[PDB]
């Protein structure tokens, strides 16, 4: 309700005047640190190729993951990507398929 010591607690944003704290709307937005933000951050909506590992709260932003078989990375945040089923000729499985990489063959 009060901004404690000039900040608003996690899961809240601060008003313009800075006299009152306001809670984020569970499921639509969130904030994680004590803050003086004019308004809360929008929750990340999982893609169709992704699963929701953890749902969005006020205090936390949803965590999404690539569905079994796929992975992602910095340059491919749009659509998760199929792992390769195996290696080429004269190369072997070293690293597995994860939600964050391809298999690695050497």
């Amino acid at each position: 309700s009060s901004p404690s010591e000039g900040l608003c607690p996690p899961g809240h944003h601060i008003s313009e005047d800075g006299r009152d704290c306001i809670s984020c709307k569970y499921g639509q937005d969130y904030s994680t640190h004590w803050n003086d933000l004019l308004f809360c951050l929008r929750c990340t909506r999982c893609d169709s190729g992704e699963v929701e590992l953890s749902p969005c709260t006020t205090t936390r932003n949803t965590v999404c993951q690539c569905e079994e078989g796929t992975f992602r990375e910095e340059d491919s945040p749009e659509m998760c990507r199929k792992c390769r089923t195996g290696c080429p000729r004269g190369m072997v499985k070293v690293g597995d398929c994860t939600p964050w990489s391809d298999i690695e063959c050497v």
Partner: antibody
């Protein structure tokens, strides 16, 4: 007089480190928020990163996440931007900037604008072999 | 993910003309847009903050005047020295600037 002299820009090889340094004088970096924002030659502005020492909070842009790291040393009253695995696309003039929040008010009794209200002169970074 | 869209990308106006640069945010941002004047070589300068507030020391001829999705910087008696690129920026969220609007002085 407030000013934010930055330093550290210059020529880097692709896939290389480059630390920018934003030296704040005339005020206390703590109670404020310091954002870096960059501009590719002849093009518009693009916010890179932010850091608010009063809370501990950092945010970055996605076109820079996991490569760039923002930091700040109240003792030295500077803010940094460590730039790693640089690309040709990162070449720009990087600006640092003071951002008046409200804790700005609670702390020093500033006037806040919830905007970037002082900008450093900017150093150029060019990434090319 | 917000996107600030300015209009126009460029204009020509004569000294003493009234210039009007407008800027439309893709999502609603309350009154949380700022406006910046950037001149060649120099770093951006904040003119209007909050949407309609004149930043300290800026000339009164600059006027910010929006709320919601649509926002309108009005340069009033355009001067020789107002040749500059001008950006509306959603502040509070991600800090998306607009593509910029380019004013040049007709003579």
């Amino acid at each position: 007089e407030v000013q934010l002299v930055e330093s550290g820009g210059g020529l880097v090889q692709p896939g290389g480190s480059l630390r920018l340094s934003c030296a704040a004088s005339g005020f206390s970096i703590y109670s404020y928020s310091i954002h870096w924002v960059r501009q590719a030659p002849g093009k518009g502005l693009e916010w890179v990163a932010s850091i608010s020492p009063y809370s501990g909070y950092t945010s970055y842009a996605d076109s820079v996440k996991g490569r760039f790291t923002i930091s700040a040393d109240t003792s030295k009253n500077t803010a940094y931007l460590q730039m790693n695995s640089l690309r040709a696309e990162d070449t720009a003039v990087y600006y640092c900037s003071r951002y008046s929040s409200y804790y700005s008010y609670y702390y020093s009794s500033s006037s806040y604008s919830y905007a970037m209200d002082y900008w450093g002169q900017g150093t150029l970074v060019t990434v090319s072999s | 993910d917000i996107q600030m869209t300015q209009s126009p990308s460029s204009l020509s106006a004569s000294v003493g003309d009234r210039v009007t640069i407008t800027c439309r945010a893709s999502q609603d941002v309350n009154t949380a847009v700022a406006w910046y004047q950037q001149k060649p070589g120099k770093a951006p300068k904040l003119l209007i903050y909050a949407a309609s507030y004149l930043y300290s020391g800026v000339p009164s001829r600059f006027s910010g005047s929006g709320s919601g999705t649509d926002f309108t910087l009005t340069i009033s008696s355009l001067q020789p020295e107002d040749f500059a690129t001008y950006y509306c920026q959603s502040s509070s969220s991600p800090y998306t600037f607009g593509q910029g609007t380019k004013v040049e002085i007709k003579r």
